[PDB]
Amino acid sequence: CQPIFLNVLEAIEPGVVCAGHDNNQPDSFAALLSSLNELGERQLVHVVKWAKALPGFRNLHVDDQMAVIQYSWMGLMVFAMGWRSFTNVNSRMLYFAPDLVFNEYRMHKSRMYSQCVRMRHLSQEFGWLQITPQEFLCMKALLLFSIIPVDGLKNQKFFDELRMNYIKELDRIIACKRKNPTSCSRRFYQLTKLLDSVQPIARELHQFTFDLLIKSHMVSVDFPEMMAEIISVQVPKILSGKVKPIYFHT
Ligand SMILES: C[C@]12CCC(=O)C[C@@H]1CC[C@@H]1[C@@H]2CC[C@]2(C)[C@@H](O)CC[C@@H]12
C-alpha cells in the first residue's frame, strides 16, 4: 500500500529560496530586515503554489483559500525555517536562507533577538523530539489550517472538514510504527504541543513586522508589494483579535 498522502506532500515541498542579501557588506539593521522582507515576498510565491497543490485545498471557497494563506504564512514560514535550521546547521544558527544565516550577533542586530532565540528553541525541538521528515511535512500542512476569523470563513464547514482530514493523516503517520495506543497518544500530545508553540512566536513576529512597516520610512527598511499589503490588511486583523489561532491545548 503506497502512502499517497505523504507522496504528495513530499512532491510539492518547495525547493531552496534565496534572500538576495549582500553578505559582503557589514551587517546593518536596515539591510538585514530589508532582506528578510524580500525573502518573505519570495517565499510567499512558493507558499501559495504549495498550498494550492495540497490535497483537498481546492475544495475551499476561493476567498477562503487566499485568506488562510494570508493569515497562516508567518507560522508556516517560521516552522519551515526552524526545520531548515535543524537539518542544515543542527540549529546552531537560524537558516532563513542559504544566503541569510543568522548567528547571535545578527539576531541582536535585527532587533528581534528574543524572537530569534525562541525560533532557535523551536529548531532544537525538531532534534529533541526526533521529529521525522514525514511528521514535519504533515505538521506544516496543518499549520495552514490553524488560524481563522472569529466571524467565520465563507464556507467554514469545508474548512473544518479539510482540517479534520489532515489531523486524521497525522494520526496515521503516528500509528505507522506504533502498535501501542498509549505511545500514539503520547506522540500526538508532543506534536500538538509543538504546533501550539508556533503560534505565540508568530504573534510576536506579527507585532514586530506591523510596527516596523508603520515606521519603515524612518528606519530605511524596504517592504515589497505583497508583504506591505498583507501586513497592513491581514496582519492587523490578527493583532486586533478578529482572527485567532486554533490551539489544541489551553
Ligand atoms: C517570514 C520570514 C521570512 C521567511 C523565513 O524563513 C522566516 C522569517 C521569520 C521572520 C520574518 C521573515 C519575513 C519578514 C519579516 C516579517 C520582518 O518584517 C520581521 C519578521 C520577518
Residue numbers in the entry: 669 to 918
Quote the study that presented this structure, word for word:
The androgen receptor (AR) is the cellular mediator of the actions of the hormone 5-α dihydrotestosterone (DHT). Androgen binding to AR leads to activation of genes involved in the development and maintenance of the male reproductive system and other tissues such as bone and muscle. AR is distinguished from other nuclear receptors in that after hormone binding, it preferentially responds to a specialized set of coactivators bearing aromatic-rich motifs, while responding poorly to coactivators bearing the leucine-rich “NR box” motifs favored by other nuclear receptors. Structures of AR in complex with FxxLF, LxxLL, FxxLW, WxxLF, WxxVW, FxxFF, and FxxYF motifs reveal a changing surface of the AR coactivator binding interface that permits accommodation of both AR-specific aromatic-rich motifs and canonical leucine-rich motifs.
The unbranched side chains of Lys720 and Met734 move from an extended conformation over the +5 pocket to one almost perpendicular to the surface of the protein. Only side chains move to accommodate the array of peptides, sometimes considerably, with the unbranched side chains of Lys720, Met734, and Met894 making the largest conformational changes upon binding of peptide.
